[PDB]
Amino acid sequence: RQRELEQQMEAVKRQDARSNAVAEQGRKTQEFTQQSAQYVEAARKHYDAAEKLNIPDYQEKEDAFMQLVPPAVGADIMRLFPEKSAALMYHLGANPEKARQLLAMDGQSALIELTRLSERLTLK
Amino acid sequence: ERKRQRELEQQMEAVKRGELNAVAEQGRKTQEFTQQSAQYVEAARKHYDAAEKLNIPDYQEKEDAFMQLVPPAVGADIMRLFPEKSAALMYHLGANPEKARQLLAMDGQSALIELTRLSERLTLKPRGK
């Protein structure tokens, strides 16, 4: 997953109105850059999670989550809760219904619930 | 607050009263608006009732502060996306205009967090014996 993120990074690696637009473009490029960076750091933490974990079931739980969700979004999610992303992934994977439940209903709230999810969780 | 429950309810009720291919556009708009309004009412009463349940003396007061602070819809949406939690958080809203401003400044995904984090932070885990 990191390498896929790395490819996005690799992409980065490789008159008044115009001033407003060129400026807007600079801002946009920078934004993309930062998000992607968020994505590698997210990857860094995701793999911080993955390396500290050595769990392919957690990886499998994610796989269930992955079929369910677009990865970049999950990565943004990883960005949101770097500390518990792995944990978060595990719950959802364990809870196949819950993640879709998040999708079907109030995704905005669902992410909000994600912290809670990222919460009541009593770890191991 | 009970009086102010009406203020929010009234604007909505008035629209609820209805003195507002093309017809398909119409149906979509109307129904959606109506659903949103019903939600707002669940919320309006809730915003007000829960606030009453708190009864902290400045609810409505602060409401103004927050309302002025932010586009009303944001908060309203927040109410939608928050139970009593909401109004209490509205309370907090007034509780922190600059902080709130920071909360506002933060991007939309971040915004969730703002609300998010605040909510539990802002609630009542009970106690034992």
Residue numbers in the entry:
A (entry chain A): 72 to 85, 139 to 248
B (entry chain B): 69 to 88, 144 to 252
Question: Anything the authors wrote about it?
Answer:
Tailed double-stranded DNA (dsDNA) bacteriophages and their eukaryotic counterparts, such as herpesviruses, possess a dodecameric portal at a unique vertex of the capsid; this portal serves as a channel for DNA packaging during viral assembly and delivery. The portal interacts with multiple copies of a scaffolding protein (SP) to form a nucleation complex, which initiates the assembly of the major capsid protein (i.e., coat protein) and other minor proteins into a procapsid. The P22 procapsid consists of an icosahedral coat comprising 415 coat protein (gene product [gp] 5) subunits, a dodecameric ring comprising portal protein (gp1) subunits located at a unique capsid vertex, and an internal core comprising approximately 250–300 SP (gp8) subunits and 3 ejection proteins.
Each nodule comprised two copies of the base domain (base dimer) interacting with each other. We referred to the bases near the portal axis as inner base and those far from the axis as outer base. The two base domains likely interacted through electrostatic interactions. Residues Arg240, Glu243, and Arg244 of the inner base domain were located close to residues Arg240 and Glu243 of the outer base domain. Furthermore, each nodule interacted with the portal through the stacking of the inner base on a loop (residues 495–504) of the portal wing. Local reconstruction of the side nodule and stalk-like structure revealed that the side nodule comprised two copies of the base domain, whereas the stalk comprised the column domain, which connected one of the two base domains in the side nodule. The nodules, side nodules, and windmill blades were all dimers of the SP base domain. The SP dimer primarily forms through interactions between two copies of the same α-helix (residues 231–245) within the base domains; this explains why a recombinant SP fragment (residues 238–303) weakly self-associates into dimers.
